[PDB]
Amino acid sequence: QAPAYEEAAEELAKS
Structure with missing residues (x-):
C-alpha cells in the first residue's frame, strides 16, 4: 500500500 509515503x-x- 502507499500511505502518503x-x-x-x-x-x-x-530534492
Missing part, C-alpha cells in the same frame, strides 16, 4: 519517494529523489 509514495509521494515523498518522488520528493526525496527530487
Whole structure:
C-alpha cells in the first residue's frame, strides 16, 4: 500500500 509515503519517494529523489 502507499500511505502518503509514495509521494515523498518522488520528493526525496527530487530534492
